[PDB]
Design a protein around this motif. Sequence first.
Motif, PDB file in Angstrom:
ATOM      1  N   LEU A 220       7.017  31.301  17.342  1.00  0.00           N
ATOM      2  CA  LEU A 220       6.645  31.188  15.927  1.00  0.00           C
ATOM      3  C   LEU A 220       7.762  31.459  14.901  1.00  0.00           C
ATOM      4  CD1 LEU A 220       3.130  32.915  15.783  1.00  0.00           C
ATOM      5  CD2 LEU A 220       3.761  30.636  16.639  1.00  0.00           C
ATOM      6  N   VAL A 223       8.635  30.976  10.855  1.00  0.00           N
ATOM      7  CA  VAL A 223       8.116  31.790   9.752  1.00  0.00           C
ATOM      8  C   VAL A 223       8.997  33.012   9.402  1.00  0.00           C
ATOM      9  CG1 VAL A 223       5.718  31.079  10.191  1.00  0.00           C
ATOM     10  CG2 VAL A 223       6.600  33.175  11.234  1.00  0.00           C
ATOM     11  N   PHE A 241       0.757  17.537  14.215  1.00  0.00           N
ATOM     12  CA  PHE A 241      -0.685  17.715  14.079  1.00  0.00           C
ATOM     13  C   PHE A 241      -1.387  16.457  13.538  1.00  0.00           C
ATOM     14  CE2 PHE A 241      -0.267  22.575  13.234  1.00  0.00           C
ATOM     15  CZ  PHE A 241      -0.117  22.814  14.588  1.00  0.00           C
ATOM     16  N   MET A 258      -6.520  20.922  10.302  1.00  0.00           N
ATOM     17  CA  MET A 258      -5.059  20.998  10.362  1.00  0.00           C
ATOM     18  C   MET A 258      -4.399  19.744  10.953  1.00  0.00           C
ATOM     19  SD  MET A 258      -4.605  23.711  13.474  1.00  0.00           S
ATOM     20  CE  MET A 258      -3.934  23.199  15.065  1.00  0.00           C
ATOM     21  N   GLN A 271      -1.864  27.819   6.007  1.00  0.00           N
ATOM     22  CA  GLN A 271      -0.729  28.703   6.267  1.00  0.00           C
ATOM     23  C   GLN A 271      -1.067  30.162   5.983  1.00  0.00           C
ATOM     24  OE1 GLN A 271       2.759  27.872   7.572  1.00  0.00           O
ATOM     25  NE2 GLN A 271       0.990  26.746   8.381  1.00  0.00           N
ATOM     26  N   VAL A 278      -2.355  35.346  12.578  1.00  0.00           N
ATOM     27  CA  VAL A 278      -1.485  35.158  13.726  1.00  0.00           C
ATOM     28  C   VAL A 278      -0.096  35.763  13.566  1.00  0.00           C
ATOM     29  CG1 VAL A 278      -0.434  33.491  15.282  1.00  0.00           C
ATOM     30  CG2 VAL A 278      -2.667  33.002  14.231  1.00  0.00           C
TER      31      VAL A 278
END
Length: 314
Positions: A220, A223, A241, A258, A271, A278
């Motif tokens: 991830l 971010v 997606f 999404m 988001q 998450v």
Amino acid sequence: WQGLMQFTLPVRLCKEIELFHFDIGPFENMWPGIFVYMVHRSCGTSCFELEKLCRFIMSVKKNYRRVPYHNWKHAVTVAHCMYAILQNNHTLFTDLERKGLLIACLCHDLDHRGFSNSYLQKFDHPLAALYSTSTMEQHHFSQTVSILQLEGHNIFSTLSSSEYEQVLEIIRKAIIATDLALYFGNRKQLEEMYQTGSLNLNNQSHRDRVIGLMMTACDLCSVTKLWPVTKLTANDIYAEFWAEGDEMKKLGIQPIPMMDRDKKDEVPQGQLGFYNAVAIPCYTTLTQILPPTEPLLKACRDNLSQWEKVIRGE
Ligand SMILES: Cc1nc2c3ccccc3nc(SCc3nc4ccccc4[nH]3)n2n1
Ligand SMILES: [Mg+2]
Ligand SMILES: [Zn+2]
């Protein structure tokens, strides 16, 4: 791979590659060499045969597809984040784990087709028949082993059998752990263990759970990059997606939101949910267990408040 053997990292990159926020994006031609560099700095100059390693790297490269997000670039981005994690927590891990985890991050999305595990399950894709849970992640591992067993690619040839099969297990576990469906259980347990003081890295089961969270944290990490790089990598994610949501619309099936390009007003809010549900949780627990990784949580928070600015048009 001939050019990769005599490749060298510019002295400027040597400083910055160590930083969590480092963004590899601008140096496409150096990515394989950056990975070689990272393996040498963490695992040493003496453990991997230069030639076999370089060949393995380029075959890994060749078996990533040109899809919006789960591509060669993402593989190396996830490898790098692990490098910085490993470098800031070096002696908490064994030499074999660092060998296995850096390779695992590079190989963790091999041959990704741009489709989620639910898509493959729902439309009885062959792979969903072989692998009934963590379908793609099990394919990604099986893909790793296949490259490893190619002529000249076995970078773990100089290991004992015991050690070889040890590093395959670090790897297999680590790749499976990138199935986000497993993360949520993993994090909650790790949170409880830390909060009760029961956590123990000498406990193997615990140790596998920490490694799993490291892999999530790594998967991830877009971010934790600077806002503009983060923004940009979000385009890549939703591009994939929507591509998948489109394939469902061809079959007259409304996709989840999404994956619906006609619902992209909901992205900013989507988001926000992702950071709260998450990402923030991930780096919060990771920072409790490995404090030197705090800058990841710091950058994640910064980007959350960026998505907060957007929601109210700023
Ligand atoms: C920047 C980014 N990375 C991811 C990502 C990475 C791996 C797996 C799923 C990912 N999903 C997203 S956005 C879609 C989403 N919103 C959620 C809110 C709560 C729980 C899961 C969510 N996934 N995003 N967004
Ligand atoms: Mg994956
Ligand atoms: Zn990934």
